[PDB]
Each structure stands twice: as structure tokens, then as C-alpha cells.
Amino acid sequence: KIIVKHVTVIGGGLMGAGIAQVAAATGHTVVLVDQTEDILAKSKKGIEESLRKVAKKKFAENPKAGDECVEKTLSTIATSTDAASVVHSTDLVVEAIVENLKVKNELFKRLDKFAAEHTIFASNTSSLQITSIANATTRQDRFAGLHFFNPVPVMKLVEVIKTPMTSQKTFESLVDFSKALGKHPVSCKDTPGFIVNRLLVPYLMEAIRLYERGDASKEDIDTAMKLGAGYPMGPFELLDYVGLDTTKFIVDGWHEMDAENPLHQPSPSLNKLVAENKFGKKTGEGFYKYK
Amino acid sequence: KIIVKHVTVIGGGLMGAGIAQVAAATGHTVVLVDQTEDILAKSKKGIEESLRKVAKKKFAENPKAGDECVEKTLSTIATSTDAASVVHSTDLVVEAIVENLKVKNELFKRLDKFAAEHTIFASNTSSLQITSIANATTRQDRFAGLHFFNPVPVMKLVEVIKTPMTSQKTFESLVDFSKALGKHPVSCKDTPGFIVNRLLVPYLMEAIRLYERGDASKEDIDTAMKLGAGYPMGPFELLDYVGLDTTKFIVDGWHEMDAENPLHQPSPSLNKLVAENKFGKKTGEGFYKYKLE
Numbered sequence: 001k002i003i004v005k006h007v008t009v010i011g012g013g014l015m016g017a018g019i020a021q022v023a024a025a026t027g028h029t030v031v032l033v034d035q036t037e038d039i040l041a042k043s044k045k046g047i048e049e050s051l052r053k054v055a056k057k058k059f060a061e062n063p064k065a066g067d068e069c070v071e072k073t074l075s076t077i078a079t080s081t082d083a084a085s086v087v088h089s090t091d092l093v094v095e096a097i098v099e100n101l102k103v104k105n106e107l108f109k110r111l112d113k114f115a116a117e118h119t120i121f122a123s124n125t126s127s128l129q130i131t132s133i134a135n136a137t138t139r140q141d142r143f144a145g146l147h148f149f150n151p152v153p154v155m156k157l158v159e160v161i162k163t164p165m166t167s168q169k170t171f172e173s174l175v176d177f178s179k180a181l182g183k184h185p186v187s188c189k190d191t192p193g194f195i196v197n198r199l200l201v202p203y204l205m206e207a208i209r210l211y212e213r214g215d216a217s218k219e220d221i222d223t224a225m226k227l228g229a230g231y232p233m234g235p236f237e238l239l240d241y242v243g244l245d246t247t248k249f250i251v252d253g254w255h256e257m258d259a260e261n262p263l264h265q266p267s268p269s270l271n272k273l274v275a276e277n278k279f280g281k282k283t284g285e286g287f288y289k290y291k
Numbered sequence: 292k293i294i295v296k297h298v299t300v301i302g303g304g305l306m307g308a309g310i311a312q313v314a315a316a317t318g319h320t321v322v323l324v325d326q327t328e329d330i331l332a333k334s335k336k337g338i339e340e341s342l343r344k345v346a347k348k349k350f351a352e353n354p355k356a357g358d359e360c361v362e363k364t365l366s367t368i369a370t371s372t373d374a375a376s377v378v379h380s381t382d383l384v385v386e387a388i389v390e391n392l393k394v395k396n397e398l399f400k401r402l403d404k405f406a407a408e409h410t411i412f413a414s415n416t417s418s419l420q421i422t423s424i425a426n427a428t429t430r431q432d433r434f435a436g437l438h439f440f441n442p443v444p445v446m447k448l449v450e451v452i453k454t455p456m457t458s459q460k461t462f463e464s465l466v467d468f469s470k471a472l473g474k475h476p477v478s479c480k481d482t483p484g485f486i487v488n489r490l491l492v493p494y495l496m497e498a499i500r501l502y503e504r505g506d507a508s509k510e511d512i513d514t515a516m517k518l519g520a521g522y523p524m525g526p527f528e529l530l531d532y533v534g535l536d537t538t539k540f541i542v543d544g545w546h547e548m549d550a551e552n553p554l555h556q557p558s559p560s561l562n563k564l565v566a567e568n569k570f571g572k573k574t575g576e577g578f579y580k581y582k583l584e
């Protein structure tokens with residue numbers, strides 16, 4: 001089989017860094033790629049901090065081993081500002097860069113010429129169709145979606161997205177990898193939203209619309225889903241959490257794709273917040289104000 | 292103000308039973324009403340079992356304390372086959388019977404003649420407008436929705452629905468009553484699905500479709516929502532928990548009001564199961580087969 005051992009993660013964002021961190025943490029040799037050394041420096045530092053916060057809790061009875069474990073994981077993460085040189089022999093390429101098709105297709109089209117033969121390609125994209133990216137290459141059978149959730153290092157779920165062209169061996173390789181990461185892989189076809197976002201996002205929009213109709217308050221709607229349906233967070237608390245701009249972008253993506261479906265109709269209230277840079281917790285204000 | 296102390300719950304079903312239980316466990320005098328004495332005995336048996344379950348848990352170390360807890364509560368739940376025979380002296384009526392408009396109105400039109408003036412009428416209906424049922428009486432200022440969630444003994448939420456005619460006084464009272472039950476009440480307009488069902492049911496339908504569409508399996512969709520969304524139950528386990536028939540009916544109703552709306556399009560899988568009398572856990576089988584209890 002194609003046992004993934006060496007992994008190339010392109011993108012130093014929280015997602016990219018999280019994926020690198022878990023892979024590093026489970027015995028994989030990792031190479032994190034990005035545009036500048038400064039970015040890489042920060043991202044890796046981010047991983048270092050995250051890794052220590054956990055070690056100070058698990059290795060409280062023996063801090064020596066803790067620092068060891070942390071050092072061993074950091075050193076298994078390498079950095080580079082040139083993907084082409086790195087992917088010449090990597091087993092897997094996981095992409096987690098800006099959510100723009102053009103940009104993504106250039107990268108992979110390029111990497112598809114330097115990457116080894118067996119190299120599997122996979123995107124972590126939330127607002128695009130895997131198939132649209134895989135066709136920017138000729139490695140389609142080795143192209144798939146590998147969708148994670150934030151905080152990557154904590155969230156055990158990973159959606160192994162298989163396209164009609166994706167190989168069966170490719171699928172099984174990503175399923176075994178996901179487990180090797182200590183994750184729980186679920187399967188899904190290259191359909192907009194896959195499983196989680198497909199069922200979670202529209203619901204959130206629905207909650208926003210119910211509020212705009214004047215039928216209930218955001219507070220009561222939140223109390224309602226927590227106490228009535230046993231949810232961790234009400235839809236509004238959750239929106240601020242996952243990011244209002246992040247949500248808007250994804251919905252607009254489906255909206256533009258299917259202008260008729262009423263489920264993807266824009267929300268004036270959502271749009272307003274986004275326009276006036278009120279993205280949620282990551283700006284101290286979304287539907288609610290923070291800190 | 293008039294504080295609710297005496298409550299008349301109509302419907303020995305799982306919902307009514309639960310409402311009676313929580314009401315009685317929180318110091319309210321309760322009368323549970325259903326068609327026969329055997330039905331009532333069966334319903335009250337389920338309540339007792341649910342109570343000894345809560346007791347041998349809160350008093351896992353003191354059986355005697357657990358017995359008294361159960362006894363006191365259980366002795367404040369009286370049973371009658373004709374609500375008209377008790378409402379003349381009750382403060383609140385909570386109806387949770389067949390989701391049939393004619394049967395509900397018939398019930399309230401009659402009780403509206405035996406009930407004391409202050410008595411408030413409330414329906415736990417999930418698929419009807421509270422306004423529809425209210426206009427079957429001359430007590431609309433004292434009529435409202437009081438919607439609970441399964442499992443009633445556990446879910447803290449209670450939706451207090453106010454129709455354009457519900458007086459503020461009637462509202463505040465149901466609000467205080469909700470808190471007295473140890474629940475947290477939230478307000479909502481009298482719109483289909485109110486708050487929770489309006490956001491939960493459609494979501495549940497979407498999951499069935501993603502499945503029917505062949506995109507993902509039931510098993511993985513449940514795993515995904517539990518791990519990725521943190522829900523206590525995947526959409527299929529929940530469906531099987533609230534009842535497939537129970538769900539279908541509420542959706543058929545919404546579809547019936549807006550056939551053009553996609554959100555309510557019927558589901559072949561759901562319909563087929565209901566036609567096979569596989570309603571979920573109730574019957575030991577819904578989307579999944581459950582080992583008979």
C-alpha cells in the first residue's frame with residue numbers, strides 16, 4: 001500500500017498549522033510550506049505554543065519528558081518557502097491556502113509536475129468542489145478532499161472526500177492516514193458542503209432568518225437550541241465562533257452556484273455585520289460583542 | 292396575580308406523562324386525564340419507573356429517601372377519564388392529545404364551559420397554530436401554547452407561545468409556571484414549528500436527503516454531526532428517537548401549507564418506513580433496528 005509517512009502541508013494558517021502539528025505529533029515527517037520565512041516562523045511558533053500548553057498538563061508529573069516530547073514533535077516539522085523542491089519525494093500534499101480557485105489550481109498544476117509519482121494530493125477547502133481542483137492536474141485518481149475542523153489538533157473528525165475520479169487506493173490511503181493521525185474519518189462525495197457544513201450552515205442561515213422575521217430574539221433562539229435540542233452553542237453564539245465572514249463567503253458560494261435555492265439566499269443582517277468588519281470572536285464582535 | 296398550583300394534563304402519552312411528572316415533582320397538584328383507567332394506570336406506571344430511576348440516582352445511597360421522593364410526587368398525581376369533571380377547579384390545562392384539529396377544538400369547546408374563569412388553556416401541539424385551537428373557545432385571552440421537549444423530565448426548555456389574543460397576564464403566569472417547573476421559558480410568535488422544531492426538523496430532513504441522494508451513509512452522517520457539530524445525537528438516531536411518524540406528520544403539515552417550498556418536500560425513505568410501521572425506538576426499529584428493550 002501507499003503508507004503516508006512524509007507529508008507536505010501548504011499553508012501556515014491555523015488550519016494548515018494544525019494539520020502539520022497533528023501529523024508531526026503522530027510520527028509523520030512534516031514539511032510546512034508558505035510564502036515567507038516570517039510567516040513560517042510565526043506558524044511554527046504557534047505550533048510550539050499549542051504543543052507546550054498541552055504538555056504542561058499531561059506531563060505535570062515529569063516535565064523533563066514533556067519538554068522532550070515537545071522538542072521531538074517540533075523537530076519533525078520542517079519549513080520551506082518553495083513547494084516544488086519539497087514535493088519531489090513527499091507521500092502526501094495537503095493544501096490549506098486562500099479560498100480562491102485560480103490560486104489553488106496554479107499551485108497544484110505546478111506541483112503536479114514536480115511531485116513524485118505516488119504522491120497523493122488533497123485539499124482542505126470548504127467553499128469549492130474537489131473535482132474543480134483535481135482537474136487542474138492529471139493526478140486526479142490521486143486527488144481527493146481531506147477536510148478537517150478547527151481546532152484541528154482537538155477535533156477528531158475528518159471528512160475524506162472522494163470524487164468520481166479519485167482512486168479507491170487513494171481513498172483507503174487517506175482513510176488509514178486519518179486514523180494514523182488519531183482521527184475518525186467519515187466518507188462523502190464531492191458535494192457542496194460535504195456532510196457537516198452541508199447540514200450545519202443552512203441551519204445557521206435559517207436561524208438568522210427566523211430572527212429577521214421578528215419571530216424571536218437571538219438570545220431566546222440560542223437558549224432554545226441549547227436547552228431544547230441539547231446543542232453546545234446556540235446558532236448565533238456559534239456563528240460568531242466560526243466567523244461571520246467565513247460563513248457568508250461559503251453561502252454566497254452556494255448562492256452564486258444555485259441562485260434559485262432559497263436556502264442560500266443572502267441575509268441582510270449577516271451582510272451588514274461583515275461589511276462593518278464585525279466577524280465574531282476574531283474581532284471582538286459579531287452578533288454579540290466580546291472581551 | 293394568580294399562581295398556578297393545580298394543573299390538569301390531558302393525554303397519557305409520553306409527553307403528557309412527562310408534563311404531569313415534572314409538574315407533580317415540583318409541588319403542583321396534578322390530574323392526569325386519558326380515556327380509560329387501564330391507560331391511565333399504564334401511563335402512571337411509566338412515570339413511576341422514570342421517577343425511581345431519578346431517585347435511585349439522586350439518593351443512590353439512601354433507598355428510604357428515594358422511596359419517599361417517589362411516593363410524595365406520585366401521590367400528587369390523580370387520574371380521571373373526563374377532564375370536564377376536574378377543570379372547574381384547576382388553574383391550568385395542558386393538552387397533549389392526538390394532533391387532530393377537530394378533536395382538539397371539540398375538547399376545548401367543551402372544557403371551556405366547565406372551567407373556572409381564571410383557568411388558562413394551553414396546548415403542547417407541534418403541528419397546529421395555537422390561534423386555530425384558541426378560536427374554539429371564548430377564552431382566547433387565557434389561551435396559549437406551552438410546548439415541551441422530549442425527554443420532558445430532562446430537557447429544560449419550554450416554549451411559551453402567545454397568540455395575538457393572549458393577555459400579558461396569561462403570558463407572565465405561564466412564564467412563572469415554566470420556571471416553577473424548573474424549566475427555562477423562551478417566547479415566540481405563533482408560527483409553525485415555533486423556534487426549535489422550525490430549525491431542527493428541516494435540518495433532520497436535509498440529512499435524510501443527503502443520505503437518499505447517496506452522498507453519505509447514515510452511520511457517517513451521524514458520526515459527523517456528533518463529532519463535527521458536537522450534537523448529542525446524530526440526525527438518524529434523533530429521528531428514531533422523536534418518532535418517524537411523528538416527524539412525517541409535522542412535515543406533511545408544513546408541505547401542505549406550502550407545496551412549492553423545497554424544505555418540506557416529502558421523503559421516500561421516511562414515508563416507506565412509516566408505511567412499514569417502523570416508527571423509531573417506539574417500535575424497536577426506524578432507520579436503525581434497536582434491540583427490543
Ligand SMILES: C[C@H](O)CC(=O)SCCNC(=O)CCNC(=O)[C@H](O)C(C)(C)COP(=O)(O)OP(=O)(O)OC[C@H]1O[C@@H](n2cnc3c(N)ncnc32)[C@H](O)[C@@H]1OP(=O)(O)O
Nearest residue numbers: 228229230341344417439440441442444445488523524533
Ligand atoms: C417533536 C417535538 O415536538 C419536540 C421535540 O421533542 S424535538 C427533539 C428534542 N430532543 C432532542 O433534541 C434530543 C437530543 N438528545 C439529548 O439531548 C440527549 O441525548 C438526552 C437528553 C436524550 C440524553 O442523552 P445521553 O447523554 O445519552 O443520556 P442517557 O444515556 O440517555 O442517560 C444518561 C442521562 O440522561 C438522563 N435521562 C435520559 N432520558 C431520561 C428519561 N426519559 N428519564 C429520566 N432520566 C433520563 C439520565 O437520568 C442520565 O443522567 P446521568 O448522566 O447523570 O446518569
